[PDB]
Amino acid sequence: SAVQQKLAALEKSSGGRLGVALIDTADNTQVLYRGDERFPMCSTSKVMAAAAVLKQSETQKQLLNQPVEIKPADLVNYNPIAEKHVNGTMTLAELSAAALQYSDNTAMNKLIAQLGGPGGVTAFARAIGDETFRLDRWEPTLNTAIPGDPRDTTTPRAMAQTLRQLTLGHALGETQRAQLVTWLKGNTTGAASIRAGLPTSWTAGDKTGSGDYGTTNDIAVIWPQGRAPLVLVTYFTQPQQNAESRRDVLASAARIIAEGL
Ligand SMILES: [Cl-]
């Protein structure tokens, strides 16, 4: 197909390995490129952690408004929001928003702690039928992205299915689904990634990721006009440990997909 040829050429030009999964909710059809190969998730795993906390909140009503102390020991390598509140508190809702919309790594570790460790995030994934997702480590070491290492990876097919379930399906309660979608739509980190390759009139919510080996990821839910919503995930990783992340490769993959719609 034209999409596959274009994705392979993009992959060659970029020097890396690209994975793409598109789900069209009109007919549940999928377009896949390396759909069943594992890729490091990096910050895309924050969606699962936030969703798991939302799920806890369905029976623990005021959980989202619970204050959590932010301590110096909590800070890691990228803390744009958390560093502003050190020695104060943030609520779990605020931590979820920081994680999702700013990719705050301290905020992620606070969510992981709220869930009882990395295993708590993975247990939620299993509870919503994702047998592929695995979170093995905390921030920042979950970003090592070593080729062939299955730790902290998923597949494009698996993550597209899961994002669909969380944002358009019934993995969460109605109020919680709406809250996750609201957070994703307010993301600040994704302008150069999938968003840059979509028509501006199509609304999207997304979560990016980046890490070692020039790993560059984005997962999005998209509301085009003229048709049912779509889910698009784009995962990218490179052979050299010190390769720079390439948000523009994800934009190009999104353009290729949008061409084939
Ligand atoms: Cl990793």
Resolution (A): 1.8
Q: What are phi and psi of 203, to 5 degrees?
A: -70, 140
In the chain, what's the furthest Cα-to-Cα distance? Answer: 55
Residues in the chain: 261
Tokens of 160: 């597209």
Query: How much distance in Å is there from the Cα of 199 to the middle of ligand 1?
Result: 32
Query: How much distance in Å is there from the Cα of 60 to the middle of ligand 1?
Result: 32
SS3 211: strand
Q: In the chain, what is the straight-line distance between the N-terminal and C-terminal CA atoms, in Å? A: 13
Give the whole-angstrom CA distance, residue 113 versus residue 20: 31
Query: How much distance in Å is there from the Cα of 227 to the middle of ligand 1?
Result: 36
Give the whole-angstrom CA distance, residue 62 versus residue 215: 36
Give the whole-angstrom CA distance, residue 231 versus residue 205: 10
**Structural domains of the chain, ranges and CATH numbers in brackets:** 1-261 (3.40.710.10)
SS3 203: strand
Q: Which amino acids are annotated catalytic? A: 43
